[PDB]
Design a protein around this nucleic acid. Structure first.
Lengths: 97, 75, 83, 97, 83
DNA sequence: CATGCACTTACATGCACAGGATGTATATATGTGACACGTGCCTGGAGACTAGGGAGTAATCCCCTTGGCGGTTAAAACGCGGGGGACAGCGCGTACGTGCGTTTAAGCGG
DNA sequence: CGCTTAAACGCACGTACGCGCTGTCCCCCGCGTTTTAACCGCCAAGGGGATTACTCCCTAGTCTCCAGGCACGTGTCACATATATACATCCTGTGCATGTAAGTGCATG
């Protein structure tokens, strides 16, 4: 038979990898494009330092990750291992948003 | 009116005959397919299955009471 | 120049990568678009602040200095950009 | 026959009452005793303006109440109605306490 | 002169009243003392700063605006006693 | 004569609805003190002038940002079995709501 | 320090609640395959951030003055509390429909 890992094994492996890793996890160009897209909504013809875009990427990834550990805490608190939309909604509301 | 729920339950347990017994959810789906309003008769099906367990006609496979799997007697 | 659907540019496996860094073992399928909306709302808050800083600076060029001002104003202070 | 309400009915009735009421739910003098006890553990012979003790009070149950709506949302999130101390631990950890 | 036990001065019915104000209808028995510890933690977290302000004012008696300061340090700003 | 079967009848169980209790809601009484307003006042806001300096503005330039092509895959996406996980149901044994008498200690007040 | 009284406290007792078991469907996940666009690498444009220079608009500061709001005092009605009454609601007793069990007469082997 061809090799096949059981579910969660690769998931735990990449959990260990991305906890070990430090790099950004989303692609640079579509993120910059989205940043320009949404900043255009407030005021027109905005130019961006790439450092500003990388700072937005970093702060966004860290904010999302912290929300994800809160989601994990809610899920294990809900006696589940699969995260759920109500977990993120709860975590946002507990944080106060 | 028709026959009571006991014929429905014994038909549900004789329909499949898996190595494990038929479960409560599986028998409820079997009676829903066969035709019965099981949504209001959950207490009715529970009391009927428990009564026929006490007759010795059925033996509960793994669960306790109305939970788990349910399989027919030796004969 | 004019772009529309770059919220989907934050792709689903990228969200999975963020979740695995977040210690998530299993992700529901309904998660990704919600998180897209959440990161959205967060980002227009912070870049609304950044835009307001930049226009107060009489600039059209967004600086990371303005960005770190915005992030510490929302109590999410970031280090490493000249602050 | 002596009347007896079913469980939750009374508890909901004073839930509605205390949500209506604004009065302070803490025996004032034992609370002042606890304030002087804890403050004496850092500096001896501490004297208190009573208004300061009062302000410490409504700050205290402001924190406590907000904790209880957080934990109540956590408990109903976990499909339960009886609150557990692990809910309180979850709420404290998510708030970053 | 010194005090040893006033944490039990926050009685179980008082905690029950607060939980009814919190909308909690059913309370475990394990709740009360753990909540006493949590609120106590909040108490030295505020009163350490309050004492610090009080001594820095060269006062031996605690005053209320010092409490107002110490509460807005924790992101817990209180209205009706400032000044 | 006995026996299966059907029929009929009695009993157990789940559901509906009336009925009281009661705790809350609804109506004045009052007397009070908090609240709202008159009054002295002084100090803090304002008027005239000044000096000088911070900010607004012109230039420019150059550096940094924007715009564009082409490999180059890594990554994104698509699909598919298939296990693992959310979740419904149930039993059940419990811990906690509810009720009630007690002591005490909270609270007034001086 | 004394009075008072409700709150706490503790016990009784039912019931509903966590919650573990079982099972069941189905949901993402691992494993590929395709595909596509991210990125790097390079190159050209220009523009506006920043910098210097010059200027002058404004404002902090000073002297003078006076009135705005604050402390103080004092009447006064809004409403907290009290009392009497109405109704919502909630449990609960009871009556009903339905399911089930049992006896039994009747057709039949």
């Amino acid at each position: 038979k061809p090799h096949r890992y059981r579910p969660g094994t690769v998931a735990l492996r990449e959990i260990r990898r991305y906890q070990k890793s430090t790099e950004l996890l989303i692609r640079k160009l579509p993120f910059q494009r989205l940043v320009r897209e949404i900043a255009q909504d407030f005021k027109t013809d905005l130019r961006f330092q790439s450092s500003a875009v990388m700072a937005l990427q970093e702060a966004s990834e860290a904010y999302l990750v912290g929300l994800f550990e809160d989601t994990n805490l809610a899920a294990i608190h809900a006696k589940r291992v699969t995260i759920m939309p109500k977990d993120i909604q709860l975590a946002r509301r507990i944080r106060g948003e | 009116s028709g026959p009571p729920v006991s014929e429905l339950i014994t038909k549900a347990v004789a329909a499949s005959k898996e190595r494990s017994g038929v479960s409560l959810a599986a028998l409820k789906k079997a009676l829903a397919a066969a035709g019965y309003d099981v949504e209001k008769n959950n207490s009715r099906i529970k009391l009927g299955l428990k009564s026929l367990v006490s007759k010795g006609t059925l033996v509960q496979t793994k669960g306790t009471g109305a939970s788990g799997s349910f399989k027919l007697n030796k004969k | 120049k004019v772009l529309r659907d770059n919220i989907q540019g934050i792709t689903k496996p990228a969200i999975r990568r963020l979740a695995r860094r977040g210690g998530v073992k299993r992700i529901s399928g309904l998660i990704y678009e919600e998180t897209r909306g959440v990161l959205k709302v967060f980002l227009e808050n912070v870049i609304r602040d950044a835009v307001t800083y930049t226009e107060h600076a009489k600039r059209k060029t967004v600086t990371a200095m303005d960005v770190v001002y915005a992030l510490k104003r929302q109590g999410r202070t970031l280090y490493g950009f000249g602050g």
